[PDB]
Design a protein around this ligand. Structure first.
Ligand SMILES: Nc1ncnc2c1ncn2[C@@H]1O[C@H](COP(=O)(O)OP(=O)(O)O)[C@@H](O)[C@H]1O
Ligand SMILES: Nc1ncnc2c1ncn2[C@@H]1O[C@H](COP(=O)(O)OP(=O)(O)O)[C@@H](O)[C@H]1O
Ligand SMILES: Nc1ncnc2c1ncn2[C@@H]1O[C@H](COP(=O)(O)OP(=O)(O)O)[C@@H](O)[C@H]1O
Lengths: 723, 474
């Protein structure tokens, strides 16, 4: 269909002016990784960029960063024309020059720093007019090239004399400035980022179609998550990047006004925004306006929760407006806000995980120029519990520490503090570890939901259980119509039972990982909390959170916990049923047909579990998890030692021999007991620094087995008795 | 709509309200629809202020103000009935009360077919199984499903070229079709974000589904059918039809199936109160919920109201030794109360089921209550054949595997133990078919590997115990 045009799409690399083509296009465009290519754009303008070769991209989507797009005036999902330019011709000092307000308090010589490092080792091709952006010294300043000695475009060479100027030509009115947040400023919430963009792509990008079609596009979207997880960030990025007019209501501003000065700004906020359409109204802190409940007193509060309901109703789909509202927990707001036609969509931004806390950290230091040893992987490992704002606060406190150890050491403080001096400034690992030492996990801790990092590589033995579990969890999600051929419902429960420390937890996490599914762990103390606190209404919030995190594995560990707290060898006079397990029964059997929520219980006392859990439509598959065998006891010892260094001198299958049986936990005990005797040696020294066989022999002096061969027979009994 | 009326300031509110009727009584015959009547009229303890209580007033007296020279009908939408001020229901204000209810599988089909009449779909999607997995969806959930289906398919195509012009072409959307892989992607979303509360619909289980129990099938029809069909015959002998039944027997013998089968043969609504729901009221010490259960049967009448595991609270107290108390307890007490205090005959027929007739409290038994005990035994190989077939009347079973020999080897199993064998076999099959090919039907050796795991959950002890409760009672 005249394959010249191509779509624009996001790109992974940090560098500017690099487009990443789909590899089965090579000889079509005929141009390799050494050829720069001209790209057509809106208001009659272009750019030229060197090309990279990668597998994962789609065929039709060019991958390029924000700066190369803004000048093109392409917004993601737009199409550009890609035509080669082998005809490239080098320049002699293209003239480059500072812009915006960015251009903040800088002074002196910014060219040996904000240019010369960047142009070097590069040959970065530059067409006159590009905004190409540089970063250093806790700031991103971009230099627009106003003049190119040859034209239109030029490679840069190390041999072009370089022109010191530094004058502040103000940015033109019509371009929308770069400092503003795009999608690449959002680190760690991306699964849901596709979700919001999917909802809003067609309404915001294509106003014509919904006037040319019968259908209803989403009227309002409810972003919810703990505070500081980037909900405002998301709304702004989506608005800024689709180009739609972003209006911002925040609850306390509306609540700041007097009665009737309030709802006027409110009903003006939409009657102002529906002009500028397509537009996004972001109502963050929707709890401030709209907790319509028992708890509000007064008419004027109840008035404002009203009229918000009827501005939601008032948009007739001739409004191109999308309404986003940020909330913290969903029960927070008035339930009539969720009527269909007000806030129909509900999207949970959630706490970022270790794998996500990395990207956030890497977004909030892109201007710093760090120090070489800090790896941001273990920085991202001990920041657990931090939302993305906690993370932004960490690295800014890191950078204010390092500015405390240096610089004003001399007291160089002048009118405008020097450029080259902050670029020298670097922040080492001893700053960040000092940044964490502060209170910063002052944000929320509630039930986590993320894909665990335990692959099957971590579980010694249990081969048959590993394949049994895959069938249970995998085959239904992958191959449904096969289940439909025999008219079968996949069983959605499992109950692991066996002695303690045999890996019932590991297996559950391992299988969530193999599915790349979310894993919610409800541990024993949390069920006991509901049972003492007589609050089993919490079990509903647990399953609805699995439903929103689906596909997920929901794991009840120590499901016998409440049965124990009642005794159970003699125990109370009652039956097996109790408050909390009752609500687990209720919420299980009353759950949605298949949302890919798979329920795993685990127990070390299958004896005293109530049998109602067992009935079909519940945890329906009992899987015994035995004490390991020396076959497995070898892989248990290795999967523990696959991190810490273990010299060849100490040998395994002989340790795994001497134990008639231990738990996989008793073996980790031995391992960790040995590794303690080692570090004891290494800290002391020197006044050698690795593990040794005799470390493990002193460890084995304390090896105890927690399972007494009595109850294995008891466990052996529950096995054959049940079938 | 309530929030519009609640949006105005005091006195600008009730003016629009008393204008809403004084405007509508001109145009008569007319319908005033007050939806979100909870916004105006939750007159209760909970309202604070005079102005809210003012507006719940004056609505009461606009209801009074229509003299039947008003041709106006006033409809008001509400969510649960206890929602509104009880003086709105005085006779002469809102006398009629009609429950729209969640649609069922058979109804969710028509809704789906209404919200795609303009789409021009794709050939494989049948809307029957689309309508099968949409359970829990209200009709608006359904409208949202199919619109998200149609916005998906517009995402896979069309703007593929970016044909976007002033007015987007006619012939191009007509080519556009939405396949089953769109709808199954439409369900994968959160959409059952609407309510789930006790369902009420006609079950799909006909007697064709129940192997055996021939005598029980005819006994139940008399109990439930003859009264509704032939009342004056009951009036000739001055008899009250017994409105209860108590099924008792071992587990998995079909006490639930029979209750659903008979609601279907009557084409009556079937409300199922299961064991966990009675335990909830007993732990939660909220047995005021039992009233809402029977009033919902009364509004769904003619209905079958089925209490499964009516021994559940007795078990949770033990009952071999158990607590020091008697058989009575909070929740079953309110079931007694709401039963005997129910309307003469609204065609609400009460079925309890229990696997422990031993520890049931005897007060349930007294005439005017679940008055007819019906024993539901372990099936016989006669019936164990029809149990095996009624399970396999969906999934394909080759002739090669034979039934009455499987139904032979079991001295006794439950009808549930047999479904266990069946489903265990069908799992071993799909295991084979998913793998292949790197043949695709059931086989006899599938069932032989299944039978390795066949266990019977009823131990021949308690059948004698069940046999005992039978002759002891009469
Ligand atoms: N996922 C994220 N990626 C990058 N930055 C984030 C992320 N989440 C939060 N932040 C940072 O946290 C700060 C607070 O964000 P904000 O959106 O105001 O919080 P909330 O989510 O409560 O609305 C923002 O300045 C943003 O830079
Ligand atoms: N079979 C095993 N293979 C590897 N590690 C194990 C095994 N069993 C136990 N462990 C180690 O012991 C710890 C406790 O095991 P856990 O998963 O809690 O088992 P359970 O839930 O059965 O007590 C885990 O951290 C795990 O690393
Ligand atoms: N007599 C029977 N005929 C056909 N199917 C049966 C029979 N008994 C049990 N089943 C199957 O076993 C399942 C459980 O039976 P259920 O109705 O719960 O009996 P109960 O209430 O007595 O436990 C049902 O889904 C049903 O399909």
């Amino acid at each position: 269909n005249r394959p010249n045009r191509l779509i624009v799409d996001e790109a992974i690399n940090e560098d500017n002016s690099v487009v990443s083509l789909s590899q089965p296009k090579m000889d079509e465009l005929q141009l390799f990784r050494g050829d720069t290519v001209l790209l057509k754009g809106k208001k009659r303008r272009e750019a030229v960029c060197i090309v990279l070769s990668d597998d994962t991209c789609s065929d039709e989507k060019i991958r390029m960063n924000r700066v190369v797009r803004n000048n093109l005036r392409v917004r993601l999902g737009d199409v550009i024309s890609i035509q080669p330019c082998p005809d490239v011709k080098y320049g002699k000092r293209i003239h480059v020059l500072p812009i915006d307000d960015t251009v903040e308090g800088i002074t002196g010589n910014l060219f040996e720093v904000y240019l010369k490092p960047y142009f070097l080792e590069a040959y970065r091709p530059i067409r006159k007019g590009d905004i190409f952006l540089v970063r250093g010294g806790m700031r991103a300043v971009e230099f627009k090239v106003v003049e190119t000695d040859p034209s239109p475009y030029c490679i840069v060479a190390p041999d072009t004399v370089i022109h010191c100027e530094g004058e502040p030509i103000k940015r033109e009115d019509e371009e929308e400035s770069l400092n503003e947040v795009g999608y690449d400023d959002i680190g760690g919430c991306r699964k849901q980022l596709a979700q919001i963009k999917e909802m809003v792509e067609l309404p915001l990008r294509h106003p014509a179609l919904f006037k040319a079609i019968g259908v209803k596009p989403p009227r309002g979207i409810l972003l919810y998550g703990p505070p500081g997880t980037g909900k405002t960030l998301i709304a702004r990025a989506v608005a800024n990047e689709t180009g739609a007019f972003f209006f911002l209501i925040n609850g306390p501003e509306i609540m700041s006004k007097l009665a009737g000065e309030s709802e006027s700004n409110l009903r003006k906020a939409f009657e102002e925004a529906e002009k500028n359409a397509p537009a996004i109204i972001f109502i963050d802190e929707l709890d401030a306006i709209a907790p319509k409940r028992e708890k509000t007193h007064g008419e004027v509060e109840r008035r404002i929760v009203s009229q918000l309901l009827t501005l939601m109703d008032g948009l007739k789909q001739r409004a191109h407006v999308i309404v986003m509202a940020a909330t913290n927990r969903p029960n927070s707001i008035d339930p009539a806000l969720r009527r269909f036609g007000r806030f129909d969509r509900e999207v949970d931004i959630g706490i970022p995980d270790a794998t996500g806390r990395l990207e956030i950290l890497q977004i909030h230091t892109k201007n710093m120029k760090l120090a070489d040893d800090v790896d941001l992987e273990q920085v991202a490992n001990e920041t657990h519990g931090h939302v993305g704002a906690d993370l932004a606060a960490l690295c800014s406190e890191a950078a204010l520490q390092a500015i405390r150890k240096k610089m004003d050491l001399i007291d160089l403080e002048d009118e405008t503090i020097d450029a080259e001096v902050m670029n020298s400034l670097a922040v080492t690992m001893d700053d960040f570890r000092w940044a964490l030492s502060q209170s910063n996990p002052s944000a929320l801790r509630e039930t986590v939901v993320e894909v665990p990092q335990v692959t099957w590589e971590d579980i010694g033995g249990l081969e048959d259980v590993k394949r049994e579990l895959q069938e249970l969890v995998q085959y239904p999600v992958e191959h449904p119509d096969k289940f439909l051929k025999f008219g079968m419902t996949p069983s959605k429960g499992v109950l692991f039972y066996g002695p303690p420390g045999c890996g019932k937890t590991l297996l559950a996490k391992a299988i969530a990982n193999e599915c790349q599914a979310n894993f919610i762990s409800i541990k024993g103390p949390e069920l006991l909390t509901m049972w003492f606190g007589e609050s089993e209404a919490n079990v509903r919030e647990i399953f609805d959170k699995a439903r929103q995190a689906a596909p997920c594995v929901l794991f009840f560990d120590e499901l016998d916990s409440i049965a124990k707290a009642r005794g159970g060898n003699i125990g109370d006079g009652g039956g097996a049923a109790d408050r909390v397990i009752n609500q687990i029964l209720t919420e299980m059997d009353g759950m949605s047909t298949k949302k890919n929520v798979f329920i795993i219980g685990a127990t070390n006392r299958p004896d005293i579990i109530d049998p109602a859990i067992l009935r079909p439509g519940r945890l329906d598959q009992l899987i015994y998890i035995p004490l390991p065998d020396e076959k497995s006891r070898v892989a248990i010892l290795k999967a523990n030692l696959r991190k810490s260094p273990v010299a060849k001198d100490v040998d395994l299958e002989f340790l795994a021999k001497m134990t008639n049986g231990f738990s996989g936990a008793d073996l980790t005990e031995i391992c960790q007991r040995a590794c303690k005797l080692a570090i004891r040696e290494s800290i002391e020294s020197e006044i050698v620094p690795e593990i040794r066989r005799d470390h493990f022999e002193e460890a084995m002096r304390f090896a105890r087995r927690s399972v007494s061969d009595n109850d294995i027979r008891k466990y052996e009994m529950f096995a054959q008795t049940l079938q």
